[PDB]
């Protein structure tokens, strides 16, 4: 299960229509924004969640593709199960003093759980199984342009609970974004992958999940979401050949000619990709 042997970077584009992409739980449930400039934000956590979901759905629990963070699970017990699998019991706070036992519990955990093998985890709980850093990382998603969220009042004809006047109709609410366009960054590092065995087949599965992410999570509130673009830079060496910021500058997005009013469709924008330096390969997977 050999690890990858190159350093990577990529860029992802996606948009929304008449929906809430991430309600952050500290302002009613309004969509999250930058409070000084009015651009919209989405957390990486959300994205990761989504990807976990997709992998679970597609692989159907195949061996060595289990997911560690399942709904309303208990983690300490999974730690204990790893301990027993490597045939040790935990100290209430610390990993086994025998280095090999800790290595075995950690390697067992990494081998069995796909998401641990990809993102790492903080297993420092009572049942101490250690720490992992994770080879794949992502940054915050930021909108290209300011967003103007709108709130919609709604009502319910039926009656919740008995009172003095209860058919008296309640008013509920929805919060929505009309339109918006988002950008994301990510990285992959070979040296860390060498510590966990993150193999290239996992990389292909990761690409696949990343392109088909939005298609399975339709909901009442979520509206319509889709993915538009995907660009990957491949270094020719286990250590890079150029700074990351220079690469990200090769891709530009701007108003499509003739657009006057607020953006309302993908067609109102124009996107271009520059020429990469000598030591890097540029591909468009979508």
């Amino acid at each position: 299960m050999t690890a990858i042997a190159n350093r990577y970077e990529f860029v992802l584009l996606f948009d929304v229509e008449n929906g809430n992409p991430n309600g952050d739980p500290d302002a009613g449930n309004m969509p999250r924004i930058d409070p000084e400039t009015g651009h919209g934000l989405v957390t990486d956590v959300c994205l990761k969640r989504k990807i976990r979901n997709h992998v679970a759905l597609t692989k159907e629990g195949a061996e060595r593709f289990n997911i560690y963070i399942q709904e309303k699970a208990i983690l300490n017990e999974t730690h204990e199960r790893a301990y027993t699998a490597c045939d040790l019991k935990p100290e209430p706070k610390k990993l086994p003093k025998k280095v090999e036992d800790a290595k075995r519990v950690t390697d067992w955990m990494c081998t069995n759980f796909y998401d641990i093998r990809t993102f790492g985890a903080v297993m420092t709980t009572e049942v101490n199984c250690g720490q992992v850093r994770g080879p794949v990382q992502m940054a915050f998603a930021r909108s290209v342009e300011p967003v103007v969220p709108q709130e919609v009042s709604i009502t319910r004809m039926a009656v919740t609970t008995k009172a003095e006047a209860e058919d008296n109709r309640t008013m509920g609410r929805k919060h929505i974004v009309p339109y918006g366009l988002y950008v994301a960054h990510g990285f992959i590092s070979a040296p860390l992958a060498e510590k966990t065995g993150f193999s290239d087949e996992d990389l292909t599965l990761f690409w696949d999940a990343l392109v088909n992410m939005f298609e399975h999570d339709r909901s009442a509130a979520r509206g319509l979401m889709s993915s538009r673009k995907l660009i990957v830079f491949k270094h020719q060496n286990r250590l890079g050949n150029a700074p990351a910021h220079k690469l990200f500058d090769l891709v530009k997005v701007s108003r499509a000619e003739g657009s006057s009013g607020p953006a309302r469709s993908f067609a109102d924008y124009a996107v271009t990709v520059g020429q990469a330096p000598e030591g890097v390969e540029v591909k468009e997977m979508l």
Partner: protein
């Protein structure tokens, strides 16, 4: 320390304008669940030119509506808009954070005055 009709600072004027648009809307449409304030307070302070442009459409529509009925306020409000919009040269695309503080004061100050009577 209270409302100063002579401050003539742009973010103060924008705050006053906002406050009185709120007040006029109120009289326009009774019984609303949510006020323009609740809807747009944040946005207005972040993107002046963006929204302000938008709001005035609706305000125009409303004052159009309201002349049929004998009731008046709204001519005082139309004059108040017309004073503040004449003092404001132009609408900034955005404001420095420190300026967004001063915008709140002009709003509160103006509101209190209108709160009276």
């Amino acid at each position: 320390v209270s409302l100063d009709p002579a401050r003539t600072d742009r973010p103060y004027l924008l705050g006053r304008l906002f406050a009185v648009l709120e007040k006029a809307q109120e009289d326009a449409v009774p019984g609303a669940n949510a006020t323009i304030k609740d809807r747009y307070l944040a946005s207005a302070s972040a993107n002046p030119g963006q929204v302000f442009h938008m709001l005035l459409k609706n305000a125009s529509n409303h004052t159009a509506k309201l002349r049929k009925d004998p009731e008046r306020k709204a001519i005082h409000y139309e004059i108040m808009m017309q004073e503040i919009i004449d003092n404001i040269s132009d609408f900034p695309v955005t404001m420095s954070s420190d300026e967004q503080g001063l915008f709140m004061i002009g709003y509160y100050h103006q509101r209190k005055a209108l709160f009276t009577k």
